[PDB]
Amino acid sequence: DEFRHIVRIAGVDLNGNKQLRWALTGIRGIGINFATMVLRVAGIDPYMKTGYLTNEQIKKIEEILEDPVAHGIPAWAVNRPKDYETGKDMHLITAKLVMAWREDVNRLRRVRAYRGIRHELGLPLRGQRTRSNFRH
Amino acid sequence: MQKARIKLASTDIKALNEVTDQIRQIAERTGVRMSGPIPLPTKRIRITTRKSPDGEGTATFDKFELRVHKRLVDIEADERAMRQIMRIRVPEDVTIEIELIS
Amino acid sequence: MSDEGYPAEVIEIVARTGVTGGVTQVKVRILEGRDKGRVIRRNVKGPVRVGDIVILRETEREAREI
Amino acid sequence: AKALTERFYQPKELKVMGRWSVEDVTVNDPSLRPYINLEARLLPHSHGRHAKKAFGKANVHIVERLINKVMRSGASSHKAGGHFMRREHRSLMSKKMKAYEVVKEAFMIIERRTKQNPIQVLVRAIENSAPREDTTTIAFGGIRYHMAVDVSPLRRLDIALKNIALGASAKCYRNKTSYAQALAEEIIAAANADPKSFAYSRKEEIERIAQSSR
Amino acid sequence: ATVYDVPGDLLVERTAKALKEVEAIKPPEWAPFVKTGRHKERIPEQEDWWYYRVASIFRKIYIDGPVGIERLRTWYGGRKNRGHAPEHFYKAGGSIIRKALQQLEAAGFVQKVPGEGRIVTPQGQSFLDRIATELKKELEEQLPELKKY
Amino acid sequence: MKVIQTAGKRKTAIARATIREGKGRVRINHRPVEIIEPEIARFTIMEPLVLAGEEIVKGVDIDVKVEGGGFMGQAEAARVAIARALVEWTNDMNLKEKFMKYDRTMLVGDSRRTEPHKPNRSTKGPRAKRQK
RNA sequence: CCUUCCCGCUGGGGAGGAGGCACUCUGGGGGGACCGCCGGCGAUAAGCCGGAGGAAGGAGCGGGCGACGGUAGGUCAGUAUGCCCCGAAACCCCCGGGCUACACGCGCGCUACAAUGGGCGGGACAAUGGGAUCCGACCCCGAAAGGGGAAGGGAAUCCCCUAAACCCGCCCCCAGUUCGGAUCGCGGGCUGCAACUCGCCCGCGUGAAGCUGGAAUCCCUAGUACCCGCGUGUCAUCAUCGCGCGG
Ligand SMILES: [Mg+2]
Numbered sequence A: 001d002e003f004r005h006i007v008r009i010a011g012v013d014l015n016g017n018k019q020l021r022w023a024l025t026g027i028r029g030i031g032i033n034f035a036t037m038v039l040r041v042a043g044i045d046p047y048m049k050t051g052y053l054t055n056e057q058i059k060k061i062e063e064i065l066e067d068p069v070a071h072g073i074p075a076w077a078v079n080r081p082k083d084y085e086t087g088k089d090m091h092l093i094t095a096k097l098v099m100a101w102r103e104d105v106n107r108l109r110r111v112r113a114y115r116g117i118r119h120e121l122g123l124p125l126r127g128q129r130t131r132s133n134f135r136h
Numbered sequence B: 001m002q003k004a005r006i007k008l009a010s011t012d013i014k015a016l017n018e019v020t021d022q023i024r025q026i027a028e029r030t031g032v033r034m035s036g037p038i039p040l041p042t043k044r045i046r047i048t049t050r051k052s053p054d055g056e057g058t059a060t061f062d063k064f065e066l067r068v069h070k071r072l073v074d075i076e077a078d079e080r081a082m083r084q085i086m087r088i089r090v091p092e093d094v095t096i097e098i099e100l101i102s
Numbered sequence C: 001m002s003d004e005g006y007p008a009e010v011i012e013i014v015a016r017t018g019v020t021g022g023v024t025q026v027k028v029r030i031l032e033g034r035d036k037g038r039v040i041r042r043n044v045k046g047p048v049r050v051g052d053i054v055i056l057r058e059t060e061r062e063a064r065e066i
Numbered sequence D: 001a002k003a004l005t006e007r008f009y010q011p012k013e014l015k016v017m018g019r020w021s022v023e024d025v026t027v028n029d030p031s032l033r034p035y036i037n038l039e040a041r042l043l044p045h046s047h048g049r050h051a052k053k054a055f056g057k058a059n060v061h062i063v064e065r066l067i068n069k070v071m072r073s074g075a076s077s078h079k080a081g082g083h084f085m086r087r088e089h090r091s092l093m094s095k096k097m098k099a100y101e102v103v104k105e106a107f108m109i110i111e112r113r114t115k116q117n118p119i120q121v122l123v124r125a126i127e128n129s130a131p132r133e134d135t136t137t138i139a140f141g142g143i144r145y146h147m148a149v150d151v152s153p154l155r156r157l158d159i160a161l162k163n164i165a166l167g168a169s170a171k172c173y174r175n176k177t178s179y180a181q182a183l184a185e186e187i188i189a190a191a192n193a194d195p196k197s198f199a200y201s202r203k204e205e206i207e208r209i210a211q212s213s214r
Numbered sequence E: 001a002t003v004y005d006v007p008g009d010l011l012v013e014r015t016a017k018a019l020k021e022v023e024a025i026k027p028p029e030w031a032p033f034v035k036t037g038r039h040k041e042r043i044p045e046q047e048d049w050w051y052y053r054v055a056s057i058f059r060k061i062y063i064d065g066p067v068g069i070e071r072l073r074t075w076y077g078g079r080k081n082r083g084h085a086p087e088h089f090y091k092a093g094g095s096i097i098r099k100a101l102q103q104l105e106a107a108g109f110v111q112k113v114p115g116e117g118r119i120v121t122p123q124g125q126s127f128l129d130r131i132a133t134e135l136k137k138e139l140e141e142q143l144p145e146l147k148k149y
Numbered sequence F: 001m002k003v004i005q006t007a008g009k010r011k012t013a014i015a016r017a018t019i020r021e022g023k024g025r026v027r028i029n030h031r032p033v034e035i036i037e038p039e040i041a042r043f044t045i046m047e048p049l050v051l052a053g054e055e056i057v058k059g060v061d062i063d064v065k066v067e068g069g070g071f072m073g074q075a076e077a078a079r080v081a082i083a084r085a086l087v088e089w090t091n092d093m094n095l096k097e098k099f100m101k102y103d104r105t106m107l108v109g110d111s112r113r114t115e116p117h118k119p120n121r122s123t124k125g126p127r128a129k130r131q132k
Numbered sequence G: 001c002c003u004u005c006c007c008g009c010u011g012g013g014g015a016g017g018a019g020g021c022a023c024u025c026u027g028g029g030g031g032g033a034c035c036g037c038c039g040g041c042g043a044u045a046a047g048c049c050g051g052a053g054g055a056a057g058g059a060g061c062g063g064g065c066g067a068c069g070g071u072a073g074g075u076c077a078g079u080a081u082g083c084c085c086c087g088a089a090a091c092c093c094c095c096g097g098g099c100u101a102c103a104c105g106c107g108c109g110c111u112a113c114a115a116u117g118g119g120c121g122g123g124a125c126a127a128u129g130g131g132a133u134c135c136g137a138c139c140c141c142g143a144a145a146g147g148g149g150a151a152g153g154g155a156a157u158c159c160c161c162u163a164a165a166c167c168c169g170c171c172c173c174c175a176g177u178u179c180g181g182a183u184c185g186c187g188g189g190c191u192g193c194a195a196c197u198c199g200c201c202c203g204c205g206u207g208a209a210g211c212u213g214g215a216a217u218c219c220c221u222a223g224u225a226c227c228c229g230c231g232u233g234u235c236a237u238c239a240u241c242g243c244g245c246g247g
């Protein structure tokens, strides 16, 4: 028994029954590397399937995600290190992540910097040329 | 007895050979033991320019080359031998270098 | 699978043919069937040397040319 | 392989790949018999040494010609299965070790099936995949006619091997079947002379087009 | 019997399994994290990759003798997918192999020539040749043409 | 201590073989031929041995040091070197002729080398050219 | 030959010293291949073909040297040079910007659209070239990029330099996916006087089109093409480029 074709981890982001690390990459803010980290620190097998995940294991990786560094994750393996309002080095997930992106962008816009301007016009801003190969 | 390395380098095999024959014939004039003219790998300085100033037209290249032939000779260091190999003519397009192994 | 094909041995190469030079006119001699020695001239595609054997689905076509 | 004896297979007899013999192998097409090399050649690999001449192909082993045709990269300038294939970097071009293993796995496959010498199977397949007549356009007095012509045995071989390999390629392209399996399937299908084989089909079509052209 | 007599990969896995029984071969706290190099894309998928890596290094030091970290770096490196850009060769990180070498010097298997790198000890080559003769037997059940050697 | 040295060359690969009386052991860079991991390379190296036969190999021991380009070039250079070694060890011309009709390049070398690359898209080749 | 270390089945393996140039290699001088021999075709000639033998077989293979002359072809923006002009500005130097802008059209290419594969871990095998404020082994620090110290090396002595494609095992099993890596966020570094405009690198994260491509078109005849990576030139730092190297 103990099978579930679908599993909710970090809310109701709902994950298939493939192996767990890739199921977790199904979340925004989690790649396969951060996933493997989280599972190694939580003692879970990454090759394990998600249907055989127990609610306490769910809780465990959820709380790791809530405070990764406190559990053994390094500070150089996180979405948002050295945040612009709290020097805490933290890892952000779906909604908080899009909000953080939005906020830093529109901070730049508020101060009317090149990146903010170039964001709001939807053009490249990391040194590209845009003449021959950015056409939409 | 301590030995003397003579590293000599040129762009002309014939000047090079002239010097080595000078050394051979002088050592056998005396009786000091030569170590042959060991030929070392010759350096090919290659420079591949484009032969056009215009930048127009088909691209064509000049592969210019300079060749440096190198020999080394080890001969036992005697004051006589050393004096006379110093007296050697050492033509203009050649470099030499007498190190001594002791 | 080998249907009613008739072997034929190549005895002499003649000029090459074809709009693009891929074809070779050749003289061949049947080996089996009823002819059993009737030479004939055929237009063969591909490389040939004398002694080669080409098998024909017929024998009464006989293309000719110089 | 995952048996360690197939991984460190040691040859002793001068069989082909040290596994299959050719003494018992026979070709009933007399036009192909000279041009099919079946020597006791352990390693098929030749190192190009034949191409510089005009019939070194005749002097070359047959499974070598197969693996060389299997070193394919699909179809780049023509459409097999209606499709350009155009594997560029994930091809086997210049990878004869991979091609060798592909062919070897194919042979093992069919011999697990087919209870036969796979080289016998292969010669049957090229025999009943090899056409006899083709068509080409010739000028007579300045006017073009799509005439029919007979095909030389070397060219017959070339086509047979080519389109065997090409059928394997089309069947392995973008689907779950392996190249080796496609190859096995193609060879036994053609040897049984069923139209499921790309090669038999292609032979039949060029031949019926010829018999239409005369 | 010896290292040159048997193959490499089998030997590395066997001697890794055996190195788990050595106490100076603890992984460092940053192992479950980091890749093996910038040329890689993903974390190692195994848990005992540390032991596999030090086993490999041990064998490499057996074979190539007075060798050091930069040489091993270029051996443990490889190709990188540089995106849309073409592929190039990149060396690996040095910390893995350094910590490994230091663990091995602690366990007694390698020593550190003042210059020209690190050198296997007698107890080390004994360790490796023991595992090799064992392996050779187990695959001499197979190839007797290898029983020969 | 009758030992015989032979050499083989194949496009930037040089093998130096030494042959002597022994048991049948043949080693490429300290490694048995038996365990050489690409089957093709193993078979290139083994062809002369299979062809000559166990009857003499089992009395021969060989060691090859090969210091060149690729695994295939190394294998061919080794094949050459040991073929020559066997022939010069045995003085058997029936064997020489067996080799020379199986593969002449087993005893004579392959003389081919790579053609120097020429300007237009030179990195690719001497005849490989840019697109028009 | 000497000394030493391991397996152990007591058979075998490696390492360092003299040993000597054997083998390889290097580089000077010679030789060797000439359709020379056999046969055939062409005319019996010129010569072509097949074969033998040979390392090499048909100008051996590959390059360099580009005739007289034309092209008002390109270059006075490399130098040289006539005329015209500027000539205290159209001369010289400095700061900053720009040449890096982007609704679009085109050329050449890189990466892909996956299993003729992707990832992880293990295992292998090169050559060409280059090195003085330059290569930098080796040690230590660091997760990485990188940082500190530093042997030797003005070059067959040292270093760059244990390549990748390949192989073995394990996950993935035909799907916008463990394919693809555009884009973007955060952080950490190197070069430089300066990194915003506008550099390169690393780590976490994001996860764009794209599921083989019409008409039409390009390159290539043997160690060639395709595939794989490397070196060097440019270079303070920058290589999807050029010239080259091998697999
Ligand atoms: Mg000549």
Ligand SMILES: [Mg+2]
Residues within 6 Å of the ligand: G072, G073
């Ligand atoms: Mg003009």
Ligand SMILES: [Mg+2]
Residues within 6 Å of the ligand: none
């Ligand atoms: Mg003009």
Ligand SMILES: [Mg+2]
Residues within 6 Å of the ligand: none
């Ligand atoms: Mg990917």
Ligand SMILES: [Mg+2]
Residues within 6 Å of the ligand: D174, G211
């Ligand atoms: Mg698909």
Ligand SMILES: [Mg+2]
Residues within 6 Å of the ligand: G241
């Ligand atoms: Mg450029």
